[PDB]
Amino acid sequence: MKPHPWFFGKIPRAKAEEMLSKQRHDGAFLIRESESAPGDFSLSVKFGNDVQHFKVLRDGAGKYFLWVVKFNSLNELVDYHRSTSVSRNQQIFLRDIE
Amino acid sequence: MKPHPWFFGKIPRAKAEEMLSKQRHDGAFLIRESESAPGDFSLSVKFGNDVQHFKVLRDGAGKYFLWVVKFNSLNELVDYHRSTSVSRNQQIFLRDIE
Lengths: 98, 98
Prior knowledge:
Chain A is an alpha+beta fold. Helix content of chain A is 16%, strand content 23%.
């Protein structure tokens, strides 16, 4: 086993952008510990001529995530699931009843 | 504007399975109001020779969803995002730094 090459601990975002800006492949990244938000992590990623940052969010149960899809209405949930599976284990897409 | 053909209100799940089992296309579905969980909705969908049911969950903010992806560790979040975009607005996939 080897340590992960992407964990840089507490480093300034500017320092993260400086290093990642030098990487050649889009997607080159690192995880750093936020200086502004105690106990939080942020993901810094090279993409094109920029280095984007994504806060790592946590939920009540303590799980991590960058972004999830939630709906403001049943109508929107339904329409979204006509092209994204309603199931995590199988590919099932909604189609109107006849 | 026309009413949605998929909202059946409070009907027994068995009744939902009976009707959807007769549909010809996988994905034929309906939304019904759960008799067991007051105020909740469930999605019933035909798929193959079965009719599956998915509870419509709600979060603190009141938004709806069937399922979302959360991680038990940063390690898992990172690895998942090597093949699913870290961004909701662009396709950015993680690749190890050099």
